Design a protein around this ligand. Sequence first.
Ligand SMILES: Nc1nc2c(ncn2[C@@H]2O[C@H](COP(=O)(O)OP(=O)(O)OP(O)(O)=S)[C@@H](O)[C@H]2O)c(=O)[nH]1
Ligand SMILES: Nc1nc2c(ncn2[C@@H]2O[C@H](COP(=O)(O)OP(=O)(O)OP(O)(O)=S)[C@@H](O)[C@H]2O)c(=O)[nH]1
Ligand SMILES: Nc1nc2c(ncn2[C@@H]2O[C@H](COP(=O)(O)OP(=O)(O)OP(O)(O)=S)[C@@H](O)[C@H]2O)c(=O)[nH]1
Ligand SMILES: Nc1nc2c(ncn2[C@@H]2O[C@H](COP(=O)(O)OP(=O)(O)O)[C@@H](O)[C@H]2O)c(=O)[nH]1
Ligand SMILES: [Mg+2]
Ligand SMILES: [Mg+2]
Ligand SMILES: [Mg+2]
Ligand SMILES: [Mg+2]
Lengths: 329, 395, 395, 395, 395
Amino acid sequence: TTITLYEHDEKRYRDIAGDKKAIQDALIKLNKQFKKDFKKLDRSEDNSDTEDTIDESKGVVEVYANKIKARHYVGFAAVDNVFLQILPKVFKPKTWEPILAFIRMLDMAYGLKIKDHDLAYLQGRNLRPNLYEVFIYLFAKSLWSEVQRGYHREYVEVHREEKFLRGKLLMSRQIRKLPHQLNTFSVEVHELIEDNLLNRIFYASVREALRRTTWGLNRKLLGELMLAFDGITPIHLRTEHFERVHFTRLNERFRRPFELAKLLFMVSGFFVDMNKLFERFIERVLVRNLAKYRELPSSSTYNQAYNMDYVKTGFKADKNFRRSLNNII
Amino acid sequence: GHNIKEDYFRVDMLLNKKGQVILYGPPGTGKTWIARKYVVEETNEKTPGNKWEFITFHQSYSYEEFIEGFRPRTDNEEKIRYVVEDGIFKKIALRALVKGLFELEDATIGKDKIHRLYILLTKKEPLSPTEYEEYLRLKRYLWELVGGLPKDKLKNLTPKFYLIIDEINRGNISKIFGELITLLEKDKRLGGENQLIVRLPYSGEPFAVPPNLYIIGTMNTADRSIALLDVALRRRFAFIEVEPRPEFLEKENLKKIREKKLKTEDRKRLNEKLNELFSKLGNDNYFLKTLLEKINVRITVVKDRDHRIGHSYFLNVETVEDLHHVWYYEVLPLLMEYFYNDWETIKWVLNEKGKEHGNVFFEKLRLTGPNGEEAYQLKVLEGDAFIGALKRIIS
Amino acid sequence: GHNIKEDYFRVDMLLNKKGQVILYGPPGTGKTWIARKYVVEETNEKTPGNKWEFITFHQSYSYEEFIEGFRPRTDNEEKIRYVVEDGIFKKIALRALVKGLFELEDATIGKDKIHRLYILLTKKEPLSPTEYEEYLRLKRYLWELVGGLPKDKLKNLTPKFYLIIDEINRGNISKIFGELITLLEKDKRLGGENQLIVRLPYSGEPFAVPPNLYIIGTMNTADRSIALLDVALRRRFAFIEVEPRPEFLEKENLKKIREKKLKTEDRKRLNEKLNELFSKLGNDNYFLKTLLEKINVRITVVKDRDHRIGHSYFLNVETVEDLHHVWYYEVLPLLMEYFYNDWETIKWVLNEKGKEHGNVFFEKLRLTGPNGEEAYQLKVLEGDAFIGALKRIIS
Amino acid sequence: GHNIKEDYFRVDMLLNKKGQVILYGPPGTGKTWIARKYVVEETNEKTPGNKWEFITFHQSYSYEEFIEGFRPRTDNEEKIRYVVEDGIFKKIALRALVKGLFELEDATIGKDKIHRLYILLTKKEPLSPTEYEEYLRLKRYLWELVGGLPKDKLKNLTPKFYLIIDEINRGNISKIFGELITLLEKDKRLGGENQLIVRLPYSGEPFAVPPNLYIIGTMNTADRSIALLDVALRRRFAFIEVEPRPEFLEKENLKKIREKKLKTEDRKRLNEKLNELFSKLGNDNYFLKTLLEKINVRITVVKDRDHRIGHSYFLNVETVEDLHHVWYYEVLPLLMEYFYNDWETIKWVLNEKGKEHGNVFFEKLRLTGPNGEEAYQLKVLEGDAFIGALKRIIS
Amino acid sequence: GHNIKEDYFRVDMLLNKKGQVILYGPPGTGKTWIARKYVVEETNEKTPGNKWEFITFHQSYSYEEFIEGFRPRTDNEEKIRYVVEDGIFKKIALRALVKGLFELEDATIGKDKIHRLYILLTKKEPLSPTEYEEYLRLKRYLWELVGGLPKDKLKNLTPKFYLIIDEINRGNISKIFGELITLLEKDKRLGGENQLIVRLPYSGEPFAVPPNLYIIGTMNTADRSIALLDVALRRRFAFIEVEPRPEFLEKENLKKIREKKLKTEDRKRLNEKLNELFSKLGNDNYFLKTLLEKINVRITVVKDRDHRIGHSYFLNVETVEDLHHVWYYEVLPLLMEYFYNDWETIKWVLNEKGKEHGNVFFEKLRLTGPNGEEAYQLKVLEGDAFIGALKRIIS
Ligand SMILES: Nc1nc2c(ncn2[C@@H]2O[C@H](COP(=O)(O)OP(=O)(O)OP(O)(O)=S)[C@@H](O)[C@H]2O)c(=O)[nH]1
Ligand SMILES: Nc1nc2c(ncn2[C@@H]2O[C@H](COP(=O)(O)OP(=O)(O)OP(O)(O)=S)[C@@H](O)[C@H]2O)c(=O)[nH]1
Ligand SMILES: Nc1nc2c(ncn2[C@@H]2O[C@H](COP(=O)(O)OP(=O)(O)OP(O)(O)=S)[C@@H](O)[C@H]2O)c(=O)[nH]1
Ligand SMILES: Nc1nc2c(ncn2[C@@H]2O[C@H](COP(=O)(O)OP(=O)(O)O)[C@@H](O)[C@H]2O)c(=O)[nH]1
Ligand SMILES: [Mg+2]
Ligand SMILES: [Mg+2]
Ligand SMILES: [Mg+2]
Ligand SMILES: [Mg+2]
C-alpha cells in the first residue's frame, strides 16, 4: 500500500485501499526504528526532543486508531508491503509536480548532483509518483550510465603461483623453490580486477533495489545492471562497507551513484526534517542572488519576513527576491 | 535449405569485408552450430587443427594461452624448462601465413624453410628443444621474408583459415586480444593498405595477422552484458544477430530439420511421433512456433531481446514428455535465471499473472511472512495440465 | 520406499538427455547419497575406481588435478623429473572410451592394445617409466583410431561411466575445466554431430569426452545459488532439486530407513526406542514430518528454497536427547547461519516471535544497546520443556 | 589539406616540441592510421624492426617486458637461467642512442665498441650467454661514455627513432612507464637542459632516453575506465585530438581518399561505383557527410563526445548495399550498445522519436508490459525504404 | 569437573561420532588447553610424539609438510637425492594404523614387520638412508596387508591417536589437506562403509585415514565466524563452542585452578594474596565473575557472542595491580579495537555512558567539534578509584 502524504495531512485507514492493521503496524516498526536512529538525524530547532516522545507513536507519523497524521520529517518509507512518502506542504497543490519540486529542493540544498534531464525523463512516462522509485531510478540510471561509459576496475597487487609468467617474477620466492616446485612461477601481478569493494557495493545495492522496486522502468534498468555485475561477489551492505571507498581519479566518476546508493542503503527509508531542510536551503540561496517553516525567511507557494517564491515546481524565482534585496541591502 | 544458405551468406560476405565477425544472440539460436557448419562448408575438413581451430573463451582464459607466454615445458629427458609457447591464435595465424606462402609462386620465398616451418606449426605434440630452436629460427626467417615482401602478393594468400571463438564474451576479450585489437583490422593485416607488423612482448618477435585468417565469434548475449564490450574492439567485428527462429518449430519445419541426418525407416517412425505430439497440442502445427513467439515478445517487453528463449531446445522435441523436459529443465530455469526469481514478471511472461493455486507453472505458497512476503513455488504439471497451461500462454 | 526409483528415473532421464546433471538442494537432503547410490546401482561397483570415480571440488581445485599437469617424479638416481600425468577427468574419460571401444564389435580395433590401455587406465599403482611410456604409445594409437572411426560406431558405446563431482559449486569451473567445458555438450561429445577432438596443452594429446561418461554434480545451494554459478555450468548441466523430504521422518518411514542395514534383533530395539521417542512427542507419528515441513515452509516465504532444513539430520534420531542434539547443534546452527543474527526472523520460523523470556529457543537479553541494539540468547531447553517448545512450532 | 598535410603537421611539430605525442579520440578516426603514416614517411621504412617499432599495450604488458626484468632463459649446459632481459623500450632507446653515436664525430666515442653494441641490439636471434656478457659490457661502456659526453653533442642525434604505442591506455601506463615518467620529458633526455640518467632496478644499469627517440601513442577515449587520468603522466605528452571527420565522406573526398591506392582503371571502377552510390542517395554528395555529422552531434548530446562514430565505418562503402551492411551489422548494433534498452534515445539519435511504425529502424511492439513498460523491435529496411529512413536522420 | 569432566564428555561424544572436532570460540576460553589436556587424559602421554601430535596451522603450512613432499637428502657421498619425506598427518595416520594392527589378532599380520614399522614412525631424528629403504619396504607391506584385510576388522582399531591442530582456520585447508579432507569422514575411513584408499601424488604409496586417528582443531571465531569458515571444515568436523566461563574467576574457583600448578609451599602464599585481592574488591568472591559476565553480555548486545572476552585474561590475577595491568593493557586495548572511534558504545559496555567526568575510564574532552563531534580521553585510574569504577560495571 503506497501512502502519499504531505506534512500534517491526515488520511484514515478507511480512505486508503489496503488493510486495517497491515498499514498500521508496518510503519509502527518504522517510527520506532526512526526513534532508534533519531540521534543521528539532524534537527535545527524542530522541537522534538524524542528520547521518549517518538516512542508514543510520534516518530515520522502519528499512529492514531482512526487516522495517520504526518510530521515535519519529509522523505520516503518502505516497510512490510506499505510504502510511505511525506512531502512538504509548501509544494502541495490546490501529480508529479510536487515530487520533483521536493527532488530539486534537496538537489540544490542537500548537495546532490541530480540531473534535470533525468527528472525530465520521468515526466511523461505515465508512472506513479513515488519518492523511492525516483531515487531508485536516479541511482540506477547514474550507475548504468557510468558502467556503460566504463566498467569500474581496480589494480590490486597479487602474489600468485602462476603457470604463465605474468607481470614481475618474484625472484626471492622463485630462487628459494625446491627443484620439484619449478612447474609454476612466483609472480607479482597488478591486474585489473572487477570484483572491487566499490563494485561489490554497487552489486549489493542493485540486488536490494530489485527486491523492492515496482516500476518496470527501474526493473529493466536494474536488470541490465544485474547482468553487468555478474561475476561480482555478493556482500551484505554494512556501514563498514560504505566507508572503505575512497574517491580518487580512479573512481570519482562513480561518486554520484555511490552517494545515491548510500542514501538508500546502509525497514528502510530516507527522512530529513523539513525545518532543517529549509535551514540548509536558504543559505545556498542568499549567496548567489546577491528560518521558520510555518505559514505566517519563510516559504511561499500557491498553497502557502522575506517570502521565498517557488517556480522550482517545474531560476527566475530569485529575480523576484531582488525587490526584497533592494530593501535588505 | 534456403534459410541456411543466406545465413551462410551473411557470414561469408561480412568475413570478406571485416575479416572477423561475431554471431550474437540469446543462447539456443544455433550460433555455435552456424559458425561450425559454415567453416566445415568452407574449409572441407570436419575436424579442427589443419585449416581451422575451435577455441572457447572463459573467465580464466588469458593472453598467454591465446598469443604467447612463458610456459614451463619439459625436455626429452623431462627436465623442466621455461620457453615462450605460442598460443592458439599465433599458431593458426602463423599457419595461415606459412600455408599462404606455399602457393605464392615467388622466387624469393624459401619453400624448404617455409615447408619445415609448416610441419612444426602443424606438429601437435609439444616441440623438442632441438626443434623448438628450429621453430624460433624459421619464424625469424619468416618475418624477415614477410617484411621485405610486397602487398601485391601478401594480400592474395589463397587458403582461408578460420578461428571459431565460442563464448567470446565470456572472456576478457581486450586482455586476451592483446595486440589483436590493432592487428585484426582488414587494413592492418598483411598485404593491407595500412599493414602493421607488431612486436610481441614475451618473445620479442614480429607478428601480424595474415589476410586469409578469419575469426567467427559467438556471443550468448544473455550470459554477458553486451553493453560491456569495448567500442573500439566492436569496430573490428561485423555483428550478425542470430535471433530465435520459432518458424523452425512448426511441424513441417521440425520434420525438415530432423530428417537430414537419419534413415528413411527411422524417418516415418519419427514422423508418427511428431504427428502424435502435435495431435495432443490441439492439432496446431504452429503450436511451438506460437508458443516461442509469444513468450519471446513477452520477454522482449519486460527484459531485453537478448534474453529471449532460443529455438534449439524445442528442436529435438518429438513427444509430450520431450516438451515436458524442455519446458521444465531448459525454459523455466532459464526464465527464473533471466528474471532473478521475480515471480510476478515470469507469470506475466507465462500469461498466468493473476492466476495462482491452479494449473500454473508457479503456484503461490498459502503462507505469508511476517513482513507480508509472498513466495511462489514451481508446480510440475503433467498430462493435460501441462498442455492446458501451454495453451494458456498462446491464448 | 519409492524415493530411490523416482529420483533414479529423474537422473536417468536427464543423463541420457543432457549428458550431465547437478543434484542441487539444501544441505542434508541426500544429494551425495543419491549420487553415490544411483551410480553404484548403475555400475554394480560399490567402490570408486573402474566404472566410476568420486571427486570433490574446492576453490584450489585445478586443471592439473582434473585434466592434465606436470607432476614431479624421481629418477633411478633420484633426480626430479617432470611427468605430465592425467587428471581424474582425463582418466575417467579415456577409461570410458577404451571400455567403449573394447565392447564395440569392429574390425578396425586391435582389442589387445586397447585392452592393454584399459589395464594402464585402471592401474591404481602409479605407472612405471616403462609403463608410462607404454601408456603414451597406446593413447597415440587410441586417438588415431577414434579419429579414424566413423560417427556411427561412437554414437552408442555400451558401458556407462560416471564422474560424481561433490560440491561442484565450490570449484572455479573456468580454471578446472578450462576450454573443455564445451566438450560436455551432447553434440560435442565423441560421436555426436558437432564433435570436437581438442588438443591438450601439456602433452599435446587429442582429447574428447565420450558418450559413456556422465557427470553427476552435487551442489549445496544455501552457500551458493544456481544464479551465482558460472554460466557454463548452468548451460551444460541439468539441474535436479533434491528437495528436503520430511515424509522420511514419519515414524514408520524412519523405521524402515534405518532397518535397510540394521540387525534383525535391533528392529524391536528401534521399535523399543522409536515408539518411546514419538510417545514423548505426543503419540503423533507425523511429528518430525510436520516439524520439518512447518520449518521449511516458513523458510521459503522469508528466504529461498535453497535455505531449507534437510531431512538427513533427523534420520538417526531414536531418542529425545538425539533429537535435542540434532536440533541444538545441527538445525539451530543452520538457522542462525542463514539469517545472520536476525533473530526476529528466526523466531518467526519457529513462530515464537513476540514470545520472549520463557520456554523459547531464543530468549531476549534484557539489555538494550546505546544505539537501541537488541540481542537474543540461544536458550538451551531440556527435557519436556524442549518438546513443549518443539510442539509449539507445529501448532 | 587539413589531413593531407596539416594533421601530419600537428604530429611532426608536437613531436619535436614535446618528444612524445598521444593521438586520442573516438574509434575509427585515424589515430593508428596517421601514426603509421607519419612514421613510415619519416623513417622511409614500411616495416618495423629498424628505426621504428610498433607495439600495442594491453593488460599483460608489464614493466618487465617494456624496460627490463628477470626473464627465464634456457641453454643446453644449464636448464633454468634467470636473466635481466631488456624490454622493447630499452631496446629501442639504446638502438636510438647507439645509432646516434655512429655519426657523432668524437674521438672519445670508441666506434668499434659502439658498432659492436649495435649488432647485439639489432640481433634478431636471442643473445648467447657469452654474447649477453659482451652486451652487458658494452652497455656499461656506453653509459660511462655518454656520462662524460658534452650535452651539445648528445642532443643532435641524427637518425630519428619512433616507438608507436597503439592502444597505449589499455596498459597500466604508469606501471609500464616505470622510470619513463621522469625520463621522457624533452629536457630530461640526453643532451637536455636537465639531463637525467636513472638507475634501473634489475640490471643495476644506468639508463636515459635519447633525444633521438619519439613516442606516438594512440589511445581510445570511448572507454572511460582506461582514461588517461594520470595528471603528471599527461604532462609528458602532447594530446592531439583526432576527431571524426564527416567531410571525408563527401563524394569528391571519398574518391580522392580511396583512389590513392588504386592505379589505372580500378580508379574508373571506383568512380562509377561512387557515382552509382550517390545517385541512389538523391544526388546528395554530402549525404554520408550529413549522416555522420547529424548522428555524431546527436551522440554528443545524450552520450559523450568520445562516443562519436568515426568516419572509418563509412569510409569503405561503394554501394548502397555496402552502406546497408555497414548500417545493420556495424553502426546500428553499436548504437544498440550505446543506448542499450533505451529506445526513446536511440530513436532520437536516428531522428525517429515518436514515429513508432512505418519505414522506421525500430518498430514499436504492440504489446505493453504489466507495469506499462514498452519495447521496440529492430526492423531491417532495404532499398529506398532504407535510404528514405536514412534521409530522415540527416534532416 | 565443570571445566574438564563436563567438557570432555562433549568432546568424547562428538569425536566418537564425527571422528574430528573443532573447538571454537572467542580467545582465552581454553580451547588449546582443553584440546591438550583431554588428549593427555586419553593417551596417558604428556609429551607428544607417540600417540598424539601437536601442530599449528598457518598460511605457509602446505601439503608437503602435512602429508608428503619431496625433500633433498644426502644419502651417499654428499650426492643429494630427492626423497619423499612424510608430513605430520601421514605420519600420525600410519602410526595409528600400525599400532591399531599391532594390537589386532588376525594372525595373517606380520608383527615383526609391523612393530619395526612402528619404530621407524616414532624416530625423533630423520631416518637413515638405510632406514629410509626399510621404511618404504614396510610401508609397501602395510598397504598390501590393509588391502587384504576385511573391512570389519579394520573398524575397531584399539589405541586412539590424536592430532591437535591449533588455529585450524589459519591455514588454507584446500592446499594443506589437498584432496584428503574427504578421507576424514567416518564412512570414508579405513574400515567404514565407503572406505577409500587414495594414492599420494609424490610417492605413490596408498593412504587412508584410520578410524582410531582423531583430529581436535582449535579455532578463534572473533576474527571470522563459523559461517565464514572453509566449507571443508564446516561439514567434516564437529563443532564445540568453548565459551567464556566467568565462574572460573570466582575466588574459590580461582584458587583451585592455580593451586594445582603450584606446590603446597607456594599454595598458602597465593591464598594470602587472593584473600587480600577480594578484600580490596569489596568482600565479594564473585567480583571478577560478575566483571567478566556483565562486560561479556554487553559485548553480545553490540557486536556478537563471538567477540566476548575470555576468562584467561583475569585468570592469573593475584592483586589489584594484576587486575589493573590486565585492564589497561589487555582488556581496554581490545575494547578500543572492538569499538574503534566509537565512544558511546564502549562507555555503554563499561556501564559509564552518561557519566562523563570523574572515576571513569573515559573522561569527556571539554571541546565540542564543528559538526558536534565529541571525543573522549582514556583516564588511567589507580587505587580505590579503579575498584569503584570496576564495581560500577558490575552494578
Ligand atoms: N537411508 C537413507 N539415508 C539418507 C537419505 N538421505 C540422506 N541420507 C544419509 O544422510 C547422510 C548425509 O547425506 P548426504 O548425501 O551427505 O546429503 P548432502 O545433500 O550431500 O549433504 P551436504 O553434503 O550438502 S551437507 C548420508 O550419509 C546418507 O546416508 C535417505 O533418503 N535414505
Ligand atoms: N586516407 C585516410 N584513411 C583513413 C583516415 N582515417 C581513418 N582512415 C582509415 O580507416 C581505418 C581505421 O583507422 P584507424 O587508425 O585504425 O582508427 P583508430 O583511430 O585506430 O580507431 P581505434 O578503433 O583503433 S581506437 C584505417 O585503416 C585507415 O585506412 C584518414 O584520415 N585518411
Ligand atoms: N585450569 C584451567 N586453565 C585454563 C582454562 N582455560 C584457559 N586456561 C589457562 O589459560 C591459558 C589460555 O588458554 P588457551 O587454551 O591458550 O586459550 P584459547 O582458547 O586457545 O585462546 P586462543 O589460542 O584462541 S587465543 C591456558 O594455557 C590455560 O593455562 C580452564 O578452563 N581451566
Ligand atoms: N540442424 C540444425 N540444428 C540446429 C539449428 N540451430 C540449432 N541447432 C542445434 O542445436 C544445438 C545447440 O545449439 P547451439 O549452437 O549450441 O546454440 P547456441 O550456440 O547458443 O546458439 C546444436 O547441437 C545444433 O545442432 C539449425 O538451424 N539447424
Ligand atoms: Mg554456443
Ligand atoms: Mg555433498
Ligand atoms: Mg587503432
Ligand atoms: Mg589456541
